[PDB]
Structure 1
């Protein structure tokens, strides 16, 4: 047992196996695992014994990655997926089925919005979007078919910080879990939603968790704290005999691990959005420095917001740590280890000034990603949120003059100098 993020990110969930004593995690580039005998195979498939069967469901490299992220977020267990989008999809598909709905903040990553608003309705799963952040609107949107409340721990790219505890209380009084996308909380370093009532946490490990922009992946973290038996009227599949496994009852067999066990033995087994062990190993190398990177990211982001605030060329600065931020009181309560790695800005001049400043950058990179160690910038109105209508973009805090900046871990003087010379060129 360790308390400290900086120790867990190096040590949790792995012990050198006695056979090789390998200090680093091996890459188990295998699809299969040989049975000891026929009866052993029968027990593994019959869920009468834990053990490796097939890498669509489990892999010892992926397993270290799952346990470590679980330990950092404070959950009991995790399941890795092939992407952050798949982490969201498998979660929602386990909680809900045709005829159900979920309640969700309207401030979302554009891919999430399109998934909730376009894809899932094809399967009879609808989403009601709440724009205000007000507790009473979240409560009003819930009905008898609702199966979750869904929010981002810091919305991409306007950085709304939700009232985690208030929203969790509403969810729990209605008998539904709170699902938090904690991607912008950097693996639990900036924000730890399970400590504030979240029942399930999903991540795009592609971002800060991975940290180096090499690898797509996602992960689903189960708090173990939602009582599926007590709320079985909304979730009968969690307690009733399972058609997939000859009347197996998940709650009776697995208890607090019921949700994440279903994710694995039903959803990964049948949807098949599994993570490669090569990908897991790249994510593990990033996790080994997650706290150090997230610490420098937030320091650079703070200094860079100061420079932007006093710049004659900057119209506005959106940074969650600012006392003029619309949700500063939530940010102050929940972000006590740095106010994130992100800021957005609007620049002065005509409609083409935003592109001229980005295109003039020579150190910052213009691409679709966040949470690289390299500094990035993009115009989300035309990119990450392009699929939404203009009204849905504005309802998500995405404006047409906004430049989203993912602040890297380069020396902050070089980042500042890069904008400062790009400003000279577009203005004077």
Structure 2
């Protein structure tokens, strides 16, 4: 099972011999009963792997974590209640007051809020790099830096970073590369770990879940970053831990040190855990992830062709276009479809964008991306942003109906 299409259905689960349930049960339980007191000792002492408490782990969530880990080619994963929480728990494990991270400036608005407003209240500052130039990432790094953070394809301008060059800059300064791969659709479009990323985060809310039913995040550990080698920047990864009678994580867990700490420390103490109900919804999504991503990208390519030749369209941003500023990176790293998104500029005054979105009858006007239903938004008049710009999350409806919906909306706004 190299194949994503098979992993998305089978990885991380085998029917338990008690029930032999073919589908993944929903373990709607807070707790798990000890076999005896000494069993509980070993569980709480981390002396034995087992279910302790659903704030930390849950057999349903475990399948979701293992399956996403398998699809990204990581060693293991930890689920969170949202993508924001996946980002926050990651940075809070890597950095502490006085530390900083180096981040692309091309960010999801919620992530910018985190990096620019929330984390500085905890003494964690971010140096933003706008240029994408390796030299600029390198120059931003100082002795207090704890990560380079980039999105695998930014939103709504679809900048694809030089994963390999940036990973090397990070590794050569002793810090991990963290990649928000939400727009890589769970490893279908982009696999950052294959290109040097140490940690991958996702908003499972989007393409991973695929049906807009469920908020969720996930942190995937590549297992590839040597915390011992870089204990000068990450002493909590190796030094005796205040929370587990001096447990030394690296000594105990090796390549899983980071993701184990996420679970036994950060899930335990911040508590941004994922419901097993949410997990099951996401698993149903993941079972078709490859098929959906495949059709999403195919529809997106055709929609970009439609918008190129529309007399009402000023411009098109699509990472597959040769004119796109970071096309050589998209070409290099997106070999299974150029994602599910495009952005367009419409002709006319400032109200044109909103008229075109408001006139859509199939495409929905809302915040989300990565739903099976097509979504659009006029981001400046509502929520790389320009007032002619419409951002479009292309769904898996029949392409002719998506196109027709924009056609009738254009006819109404432009006669």
Provide the TM-score with structure 2 as the length reference: 0.99
**Distance across 2 between alignment mates of 1:31 and 1:322:** 49
Q: Structure 1's 361 and 274: CA in aligned 2 closer, same or farther, altered over 3 A?
A: same
**Distance across 2 between alignment mates of 1:198 and 1:260:** 14
**Distance across 2 between alignment mates of 1:310 and 1:211:** 29
SS in 1 for 2:27: coil
Cα contact 2:104–2:149 (8 A) shared by 1: yes
**Distance across 1 between alignment mates of 2:302 and 2:61:** 37
SS in 2 for 1:420: helix
Q: Which runs of 5+ in 2 are unaligned?
A: none
Q: How far apart are 1:102 and its partner, in Å?
A: 0.2
Residue equivalent to 1:381? 380
Q: How far apart are 1:147 and its partner, in Å?
A: 0.2
Does 1:151 pair with 2:150? yes
Cα-to-partner distance string for 1:148-174 (whole Å, 9 max, x where unaligned): 000000001100000000000100000
Task: Report how many aligned residue pairs link the two structures.
Answer: 415
Residue equivalent to 1:172? 171
Residue equivalent to 1:427? 414
Cα-to-partner distance string for 1:302-356 (whole Å, 9 max, x where unaligned): 0000000000000000000000000000000000000000000010001100000
Residue equivalent to 1:62? 61
Cα-to-partner distance string for 1:375-406 (whole Å, 9 max, x where unaligned): 0001222444xxxxxxxxxxxx2223211000
SS in 1 for 2:315: strand
SS in 1 for 2:148: strand
SS in 2 for 1:243: coil
**Distance across 2 between alignment mates of 1:251 and 1:329:** 38
Runs of 4+ displaced beyond 4 Å: none
Cα contact 2:100–2:125 (8 A) shared by 1: yes
Cα-to-partner distance string for 1:390-426 (whole Å, 9 max, x where unaligned): xxxxxxx222321100000000000000000000000
Q: How far apart are 1:374 and its partner, in Å?
A: 0.2
**Distance across 1 between alignment mates of 2:130 and 2:353:** 27
Q: How far apart are 1:179 and its partner, in Å?
A: 0.1
Cα-to-partner distance string for 1:250-309 (whole Å, 9 max, x where unaligned): 000000000000000000000000000000000000000000000000000000000000
TM-align CA RMSD: 0.6
Cα contact 2:347–2:388 (8 A) shared by 1: no
Residue equivalent to 1:195? 194
**Distance across 2 between alignment mates of 1:325 and 1:228:** 37
Q: How far apart are 1:138 and its partner, in Å?
A: 0.4
SS in 2 for 1:114: helix
Residue equivalent to 1:389? none
**Distance across 2 between alignment mates of 1:401 and 1:82:** 34
**Distance across 2 between alignment mates of 1:189 and 1:286:** 13
Cα contact 2:238–2:249 (8 A) shared by 1: yes
**Distance across 2 between alignment mates of 1:117 and 1:64:** 34
**Distance across 1 between alignment mates of 2:156 and 2:381:** 13
**Distance across 1 between alignment mates of 2:295 and 2:36:** 52
Counting only pairs closer than 5 Å after superposition, residues 123-134 of structure 1 correspond to structure 2 as 123-134=122-133
**Distance across 1 between alignment mates of 2:386 and 2:333:** 26
**Distance across 2 between alignment mates of 1:398 and 1:39:** 58
Cα contact 2:354–2:381 (8 A) shared by 1: no
SS in 2 for 1:103: strand
Residue equivalent to 1:311? 310
Q: Which runs of 5+ in 1 are unaligned?
A: 385-396
**Distance across 2 between alignment mates of 1:17 and 1:401:** 55
**Distance across 1 between alignment mates of 2:3 and 2:120:** 42
Cα-to-partner distance string for 1:104-144 (whole Å, 9 max, x where unaligned): 00000000001100000000000000000000000000000
**Distance across 1 between alignment mates of 2:322 and 2:130:** 21
**Distance across 2 between alignment mates of 1:184 and 1:380:** 18
Q: Structure 1's 116 and 191: CA in aligned 2 closer, same or farther, altered over 3 A?
A: same
**Distance across 2 between alignment mates of 1:148 and 1:383:** 32
Cα contact 2:353–2:387 (8 A) shared by 1: no
Cα-to-partner distance string for 1:218-260 (whole Å, 9 max, x where unaligned): 0000000000000110000000000111110000000000000
Provide the TM-score with structure 1 as the length reference: 0.96
Residue equivalent to 1:388? none
**Distance across 1 between alignment mates of 2:109 and 2:381:** 11
SS in 2 for 1:381: coil
Cα contact 2:83–2:205 (8 A) shared by 1: yes
Cα contact 2:176–2:199 (8 A) shared by 1: yes
Cα-to-partner distance string for 1:62-104 (whole Å, 9 max, x where unaligned): 0000000000000000000000000000000000000000000
